[PDB]
Amino acid sequence: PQITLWKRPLVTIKIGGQLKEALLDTGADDTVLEEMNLPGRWKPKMIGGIGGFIKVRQYDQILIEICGHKAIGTVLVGPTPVNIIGRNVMTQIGCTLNF
Amino acid sequence: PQITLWKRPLVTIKIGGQLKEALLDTGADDTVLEEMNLPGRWKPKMIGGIGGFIKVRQYDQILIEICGHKAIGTVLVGPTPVNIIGRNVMTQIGCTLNF
Numbered sequence: 479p480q481i482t483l484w485k486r487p488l489v490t491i492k493i494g495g496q497l498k499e500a501l502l503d504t505g506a507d508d509t510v511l512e513e514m515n516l517p518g519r520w521k522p523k524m525i526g527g528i529g530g531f532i533k534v535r536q537y538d539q540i541l542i543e544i545c546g547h548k549a550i551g552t553v554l555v556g557p558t559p560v561n562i563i564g565r566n567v568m569t570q571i572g573c574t575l576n577f
Numbered sequence: 578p579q580i581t582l583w584k585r586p587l588v589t590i591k592i593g594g595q596l597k598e599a600l601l602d603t604g605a606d607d608t609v610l611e612e613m614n615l616p617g618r619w620k621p622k623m624i625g626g627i628g629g630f631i632k633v634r635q636y637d638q639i640l641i642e643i644c645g646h647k648a649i650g651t652v653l654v655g656p657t658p659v660n661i662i663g664r665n666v667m668t669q670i671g672c673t674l675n676f
């Protein structure tokens with residue numbers, strides 16, 4: 479779909495059999511989700527924002543479904559205030575910016 | 578133009594007579610710029626993100642020029658690691674997400 483930006487660009491994702499709302503974030507390099515129940519192994523990692531860093535668990539090769547599209551890639555799980563879909567996923571569903 | 582997301586959606590902006598590189602950030606409600614010399618009055622404000630919060634100076638009715646397109650609105654200045662063009666400006670230049 480085409481999405482204007484007068485509101486936050488929220489989309490419904492399905493990941494690990496769970497339904498969540500996440501922000502389409504062109505300013506995010508990778509995908510970060512609030513604390514969630516994901517299966518498998520993971521390697522620690524820290525990511526920085528506008529206020530500093532957070533420590534997260536990096537899961538590899540995780541299936542995400544967004545508004546009918548499917549993507550596999552790295553998902554970071556940690557104390558983010560909001561679920562964010564980063565560029566690593568949006569490239570796989572063909573998301574573009576247009577002005 | 579149309580912008581894929583395989584790399585950071587960086588653009589060049591003209592503000593306060595200065596040229597700067599900024600990241601088009603659909604995940605940012607407000608525009609936040611690194612420390613820079615801006616004229617006018619302002620009000621203190623704090624904004625939050627990944628890792629915590631930061632103190633910024635809130636400038637209102639500030640002119641921004643991106644790819645010729647002109648916008649006017651609130652510009653926050655403070656210790657952000659990256660210049661961010663938020664939804665408050667992208668809406669004025671007709672920016673949309675498309676997938």
Ligand SMILES: CC(C)CN(C[C@@H](O)[C@H](Cc1ccccc1)NC(=O)O[C@H]1CO[C@H]2OCC[C@H]21)S(=O)(=O)c1ccc(N)cc1
Pocket residue numbers: 503504505506507508509510525526527528529560562564602603604605606607608609624625626627658659661663
């Ligand atoms: C977390 C969002 C709800 C809000 N953020 C916008 C977001 O795009 C930031 C904007 C951003 C971009 C670069 C550096 C700091 C902040 N990017 C970010 O945190 O991404 C991190 C996760 O993947 C990595 O990608 C880059 C940093 C990592 S934010 O920077 O904190 C922000 C919050 C409020 C306003 N008014 C303006 C900006």
